[model samples]
Target chain A: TVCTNYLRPRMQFTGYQISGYKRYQVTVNLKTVDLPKKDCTSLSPHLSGFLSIRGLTNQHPEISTYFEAYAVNHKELGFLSSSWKDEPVLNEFKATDQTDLEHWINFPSFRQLFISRIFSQEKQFDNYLNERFIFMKWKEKFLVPDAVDGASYDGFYYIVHDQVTGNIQGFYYHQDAEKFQQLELVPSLESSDCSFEFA
Target chain B: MDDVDREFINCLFPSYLLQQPVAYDLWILYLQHRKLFLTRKEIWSKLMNLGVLGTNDDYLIQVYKYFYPDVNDFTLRFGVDIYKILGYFLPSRWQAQPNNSLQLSQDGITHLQPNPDYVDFAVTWANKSLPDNKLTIFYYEIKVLSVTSTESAENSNIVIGYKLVESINKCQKYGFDLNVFGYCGFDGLITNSTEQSKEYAKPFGRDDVIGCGINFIDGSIFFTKNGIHLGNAFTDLNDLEFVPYVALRPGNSIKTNFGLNEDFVFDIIGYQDKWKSLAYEHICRLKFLLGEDNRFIDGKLVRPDVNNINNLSVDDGSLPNTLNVMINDYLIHEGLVDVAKGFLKDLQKDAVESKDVIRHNERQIMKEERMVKIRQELRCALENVISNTRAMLSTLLEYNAFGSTNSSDPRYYKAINFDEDVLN
Candidate 1:
């Protein structure tokens, strides 16, 4: 619930992010827990969190991001979460469904989570996207629906997360659409404790 | 220590000894082998054999203490003679070659004097080459001192720029086989190879400070006149080793400054600050994306905990310990026993204060054990290999001397005998 307070769209995703993009509702439930025996302080606390995204069966198989992260309160930079997760373990979790989810997965990825303030801008050149977005490779590669052998695309899908007004906008290039598609995630009106205090 | 003794000590242990790892390691190995007989005479002889250019004794002492404080033998060595080998290990200096027609002034290594009688062109290169590190902004300048031309200014022509090591002795002129890239003072033309090429800058002569810099990140070379930037003349360069090169005719005399000792006419730091700002701008965005409400406020990144309902003060000062652990990990990985040991002392000081945080100290102790073993094994193995290599090389030298035209001279064969010092 503490993690859900920071991740916009606490319950579900609404409108289309890109023009003429496939319309499907995406829902995510982010649950976080602090390890009791792990002697960590408020300044730098260790917590395990799970982010499950539902309603993605139409585009691809369901995937969930279960990770253990270290949250550090920087003197000058304030609070940030550095989640260490590996791509292989994440892929394995996807390959064999989360049906056998009793085992904890370990990975060495240092993915950082932070708040960003992005705005719209005009450019003279064509296809000159604004430099306000944060680009990251999506966890799993998307496969084409037309593929009989179920071969995934060679190019990794780049998720460009941008903050427009109060909502969050994510852009990714669709191979089938041959253009950029957007996914909009809106923040909840209900506010909660997003402090350094451990759960 | 007395003033005279202090001066001697200063020379014996120059500060720059810590700047080079190879120089420091080799010096340590030499000291470990001959700790007692490391007198001024012996040190000088060692440097002489290696053909060392300069020695900063102060540097070696600090690095030695940093690495081998417990050795306990380095309290007093009469005079120290350590030399920087490998071109990049040392700062930029004009390497006077046998084929160099230009005469080097007795005052400094930078001052070059070309013979007025000779009509042929000659090029002199710096001993230090631009490093492959893309972060480095390598720049050097040369001030024109005096020019003696028999004819008009044509005889005093000077070309300032860089050249590849492959073109060392082969290429003599500015426009010879695309091996050299320089700005010509004769016609104010910047050419890599070929005549009458890209002319934009003014013709430089006596008293003008011409500067050249290589932006490794962007793969471009730019020149500056006096203190003004002349824009980039060459672009899209392949990642290759390039040395500071200057070509001159018979009568051109100039003093070079590799920006080691003196300030430059051009603002080198200001030029690099632009790239530095660009780097931080991206870092600011990265932190911002990581969910931190970080903003660049007047060049400083400030994170204002905007989401915190209760502004909590979390300055326990344990953040620096994390950074120290990171540095300790790197030092141990580098197999630098002394450097890591020096840091370990500080960690122990902190560990004593905070008994609660015992995990980090335990990890550090484990790493220190591994670090010592790694360094000991490396040093022991290298010493044996080096001593053997030296014995073999000495034998080869003696044999080559005997096979030469001076074969009749027994002194040549007797000159180098590997019997004096055997491998320990």
Candidate 2:
């Protein structure tokens, strides 16, 4: 059966201590889908429309905890990051509309399947979550500081899928400090008819 | 009357005499008229007169010539023939034991009180003629350096010690040179007390003197502490550096029987017991098949196949079925299966039953059990036939040659080159 691939949201936050001891928290919210539903020929929409709100609202955290608890007992699956900010310090928020969140969701699944075949059957799903969480956590902890300091943030990139045309909808964050940091969206067509076809 | 006479003569001289009584009567009659047996008629008349004479002298002579030809010459030849033929089927009458009382001589080292228990039959058989020829050949000596627990030394930085003082003392006393065969040491040998006595021993001096140790498992020669390989002459002692060769070298490669050489040692020293048990079970199964009375059916020998070798089948096969019947019915009837099964299960369930532990524990257990069974069987088999020393020694030697101790694996003691032709 064929299922609709949705853009998954991956939330990560990086905190840094500046010269004044003021800690700045930079959260990079990645939203990427597995082969997007819309055609690449269509015009670009506002990035905020597709953005998914994260960072544990009381209701969502409870819902996620229910699954997490069940997974922890039944299948040994639990939340990867428990406490993001251990120390009480000053914080700042910066949103990047340029980050392609679609790739972030699907890349993990593909990587998970590949690694599961390579290693063991036990804890395959757990390992996938672990890798994804670790990568996001590392980016938040190590790479986000450079992105906020106006230095060349080369590591941050994203890919979007046009669901209608079944092709990649590419986007990136610009170096400019103004105009919402230049959320440049690029459109591309499917290389073959197979790309458009649903499995 | 002539026709009646002809019929009576034919009845007396039947084509062949099947019974011994008929042949005995004929011989007695033939002996009685032996002097007057020149003429056929006279002989026949004489044979007729003697009631014991069942047939004519000519017929009796022919039967005696065919069946009772001289066996004296055959017996004489057999007596004159060299006893070497016995060596083909049985082991020589030599026993080997550890030379515990050897004194250290200046020339090198030699075992004074040769261990009669360790005597190899093949060596003894080959050297039977020569008076000076000894059955015990000097195998390679191994020196192992173990850690001595000292209160003053730190736990990690403890005293370095040796394990083969008795073997070294024996070699030195005999004025014979010893070669460094191989060496091994376990941390438990130094840390644990039981493990110390179990692995290494000081037979002569205080228990602290780490000396040469022989593994009862694979029979690999070991030199405890650092030692030298003294070639033929006393002056050829080359001090070799300490290397953990035994630990690194696999156990199956060490030979324990026949001659002391690297080629004969089995590499399964660590797992000697497991493999030995496996071999023992295999041999037992083979023996059951070959036994005159399949006593396995009567439960005289406990079959261990139920939990062990039989249950691990991947498919429905005759081997499993045979094992099931043998174990459940035959071996169970024999009453030996339960103990054997328990021992086998213990071996099968071992987590670290590798070469080392197998050598120590498994081999020891199997050896004890096997030796007991062998002794029992020997006692029963030779109860009436063998009573004297010669017969007892011969029987024991024969059994020893066929025993499981001389495993093809070199892990046990290697056979030494006692033959002169082999040296050339």
- Error (Å) of candidate 2 at residue A91 is 69
List model 2 lDDT by residue over B73-176, tens digit each: 77888876111321211112222323432221111111111222331111101112211111111222222122121110111111122122113333233211
Q: How would you encode candidate 1's per-residue C-alpha lDDT over B1-424 as one tens digit per residue?
A: 2443332332333232222112334345444544323254444444345533232133321111111242345545533513342213444567776854667754244467675555446776786565442223677788877654221222237777888655443456433347677787766777653445555766765678888887644567898988989888877563567888777776668887764435568877677656555544543351111133347778887677577532322365444444455565566665675776766666567553244233454566686797668988997323444677666544543333332343332222222212322222
Worst 10 residues of 2 chain B by lDDT: B119-128
Compare the candidates by lDDT and give the number of the best one: 1
lDDT string for model 2 (A106-184, tens) is 4443345342122233234442222222221111113322322223332222332333332332223334522222121
lDDT of each: 0.47, 0.26
What TM-score does each model's chain B reach against the true chain B? 0.47, 0.19
Candidate 1: lDDT over CA atoms?
A: 0.47
Cα error of candidate 2 at position B363, Å: 43
